[PDB]
C-alpha cells in the first residue's frame, strides 16, 4: 500500500561541551536508511540499510554537503531563537524538525508535511495544503513572517511533491526485497503466577514488520481492557519489531482468555489460548 | 534525499 519517507533532525546546544550536537536520521516507512551525527568521526552522511548503498559517490558527497549545511542552519537558528525568547547562551536548547512525503499504492504523491519544535514544544508547521504555515507562539510568528517573505512554503512544497516523491520511489524499488515485504509476527504466550489466586498471561508478538500491529485480549469471547497491560512496540535491532500484551486473570481460569493478533502480514487474525 | 527548506528562522 502506501509508503512514506521521513527525516528527523535534532540540534542541541551544549554550553561547555563544544558546538551544538546535530543528529539527522532518514526513514522509509519503519526502516532507517541514513544518518548523520556531528559528533561522529566521518563527518559524512552514513548508510544504515543495504539498499541505500546502491547510490554512487556523488550521492554521498552531495547528501553530506546538504546535511552539514542544515546543521549550520540549525546553529544559526538556535542563536536566533535564544534572542526571541530572551534566553542566555549558558543554557541548553533543542530544535527538532520532522518532514516527509507519502505516496499511495500507485506511487503518486499523497501528502507532505513538515513540523518544527523548540525545547520539545510545537514551533511552526506546514499546513496540509502545503501553501501556508501554522506558527504556535509569538516567536514563531516572527519566523512565519520571514518564511512568507522568502516563499518558504512554495520551496518546501516543490521538494515534497517533486524530489521527495521521486527519491522515495527509487528507494522503494532498490529496497523492494525488504521494504515491500511484510514479516508476520511469531507469537507465543507466557504464564506467570503472581500469587496463589492470580496469574499473569502475556501475549507475545516477535519478528514482525512493519511496526503496526494490534494485540487485544478477550475473556469468553468478550473484549478485555480491565487488568490489562500493553507495552510500547520496540525494535528488535535487526529491522523487525516486538510487542506484548498482558492480562491479570483469576488462577484456575487462564484457559478462558484468548489473545488476538492482527498484522498486515497475516492472511487472517491469529487467536492464541493458554 | 534531504530537503528541509533552510530559510533562517
Amino acid at each position: 500500500g502506501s509508503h512514506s519517507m521521513r527525516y528527523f533532525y535534532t540540534s542541541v546546544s551544549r554550553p561547555g561541551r563544544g558546538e551544538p550536537r546535530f543528529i539527522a536520521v532518514g526513514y522509509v516507512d519503519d526502516t532507517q536508511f541514513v544518518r548523520f551525527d556531528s559528533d561522529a568521526a566521518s563527518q559524512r552522511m552514513e548508510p544504515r540499510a543495504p539498499w541505500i548503498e546502491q547510490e554512487g559517490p556523488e550521492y554521498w558527497d552531495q547528501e553530506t554537503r546538504n546535511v552539514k549545511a542544515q546543521s549550520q542552519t540549525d546553529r544559526v537558528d538556535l542563536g536566533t531563537l535564544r534572542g526571541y525568547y530572551n534566553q542566555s547562551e549558558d543554557g541548553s536548547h533543542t530544535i527538532q524538525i520532522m518532514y516527509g512525503c507519502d505516496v499511495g499504492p500507485d506511487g503518486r504523491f499523497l501528502r507532505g508535511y513538515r513540523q518544527d519544535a523548540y525545547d520539545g514544544k510545537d514551533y511552526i508547521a506546514l499546513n496540509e495544503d502545503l501553501r501556508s504555515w501554522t506558527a504556535a507562539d509569538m516567536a514563531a510568528q516572527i519566523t512565519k513572517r520571514k518564511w512568507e517573505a522568502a516563499h518558504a512554503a512554495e520551496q518546501q512544497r516543490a521538494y515534497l511533491e517533486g524530489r521527495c516523491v521521486e527519491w522515495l520511489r527509487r528507494y522503494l524499488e532498490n529496497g523492494k526485497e525488504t521494504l515491500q515485504r511484510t514479516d508476520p509476527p511469531k507469537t507465543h504466550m507466557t504464564h506467570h503466577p503472581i500469587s496463589d489466586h492470580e496469574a499473569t498471561l502475556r501475549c507475545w508478538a516477535l519478528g514482525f514488520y512493519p511496526a503496526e500491529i494490534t494485540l487485544t485480549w478477550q475473556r469468553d469471547g468478550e473484549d478485555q481492557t480491565q487488568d490489562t497491560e500493553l507495552v510500547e512496540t520496540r525494535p528488535a535491532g535487526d529491522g523487525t519489531f516486538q510487542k506484548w500484551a498482558a492480562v491479570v486473570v483469576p488462577s484456575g481460569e487462564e484457559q478462558r482468555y484468548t489473545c488476538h493478533v492482527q498484522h498486515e502480514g497475516l492472511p487472517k487474525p491469529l487467536t492464541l489460548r493458554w | 534525499v534531504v530537503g528541509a527548506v533552510g530559510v533562517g528562522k
Partner: T-cell receptor, first 114, second 109 residues
Framework: KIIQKPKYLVAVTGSEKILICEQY?????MYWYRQSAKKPLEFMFS???????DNQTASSRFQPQSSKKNHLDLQITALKPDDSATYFC??????????????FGSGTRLTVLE | KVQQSPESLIVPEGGMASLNCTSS?????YFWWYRQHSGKSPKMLM?????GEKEEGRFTVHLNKASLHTSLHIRDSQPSDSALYLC???????????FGSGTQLTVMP
C-alpha cells in the same frame, strides 16, 4: 551593500590578482558570476556558511577565499587574456538552496593585457 | 541550460513587451527575472516559485512548470525599461541561480 574592490583592474599576462568581495549584511550565502559578451551571467562559485557548495569553473586558477567572515575574495593565478571579463559577486540572506533573491555587487572589470 | 527568446526586442513607448524563458533541465522549480541596465549590476525584477502568475505594477510574470516555461509581460513600456533582461532558474536542492543569455529590450521614445 555588497562591496567589490576594485571596480576596474588591469593585469599583465601571467600575474596573480585578488578580487575583493565583502558584505556586512549578515548574509549566509555568497556567489561569483562572470559577465562576458557571450555569457552575460555565467555561474562560477556558490558558498553557504563559508563552505563551498557548488563550482562550475573549469580552471583551477580560480580559488575563492572563504576563511574570513564577511568575505569571498576571488584569487586568479597565471592570468590569461581570456580571463578578461566583469566578475560579479553576489550574496543572499539565506543559504543557496533556499535563497529568495540574490543581490549583486558592482562588479570588477578585469582586463588582462600582454 | 536556460533558453530565452527573443534575443532582442524593440517596442514603442506605451507598448507591450513580451519575453519568454524555458529551461531544458526537468528539475527546475523556481524562476527569476533580472534586469541589468548598461554599466550597472543585475537587479532582481520578479521571482516565481510555483505555477501561476504574479503582477507587480506594470510587470507580470507567469510560470507553467510542466512546460518549464516562464514569461515576463511589461505593459505600458517606458524608455527607462530599456535594459538587458536575464532569466534565472533553480532546482530544488540546487545551490545557485543559473542564468540564460538574456533579451536586450529597447523601448523607443
Amino acid at each position: 551593500k555588497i562591496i567589490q574592490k576594485p571596480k576596474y583592474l588591469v593585469a599583465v599576462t601571467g600575474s596573480e590578482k585578488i578580487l575583493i568581495c565583502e558584505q556586512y549584511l549578515g548574509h549566509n550565502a555568497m556567489y561569483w558570476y562572470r559577465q562576458s559578451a557571450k555569457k552575460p551571467l555565467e555561474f562560477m562559485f556558490s558558498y553557504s556558511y563559508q563552505k563551498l557548495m557548488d563550482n562550475q569553473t573549469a580552471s583551477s586558477r580560480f580559488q575563492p577565499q572563504s576563511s574570513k567572515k564577511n568575505h569571498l575574495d576571488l584569487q586568479i593565478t597565471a592570468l590569461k587574456p581570456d580571463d578578461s571579463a566583469t566578475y560579479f559577486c553576489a550574496s543572499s540572506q539565506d543559504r543557496g538552496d533556499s535563497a529568495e533573491t540574490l543581490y549583486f555587487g558592482s562588479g570588477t572589470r578585469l582586463t588582462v593585457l600582454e | 541550460k536556460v533558453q530565452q527568446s527573443p534575443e532582442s526586442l524593440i517596442v514603442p513607448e506605451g507598448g507591450m513587451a513580451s519575453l519568454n524563458c524555458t529551461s531544458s533541465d526537468r528539475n527546475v522549480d523556481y524562476f527569476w527575472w533580472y534586469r541589468q541596465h548598461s554599466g550597472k549590476s543585475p537587479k532582481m525584477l520578479m521571482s516565481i516559485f510555483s505555477n501561476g502568475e504574479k503582477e507587480e505594477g506594470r510587470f507580470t510574470v507567469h510560470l507553467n512548470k510542466a512546460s518549464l516555461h516562464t514569461s515576463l509581460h511589461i505593459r505600458d513600456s517606458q524608455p527607462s525599461d530599456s535594459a538587458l533582461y536575464l532569466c534565472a532558474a533553480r532546482s530544488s536542492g540546487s545551490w545557485q541561480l543559473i542564468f540564460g543569455s538574456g533579451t536586450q529590450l529597447t523601448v523607443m521614445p
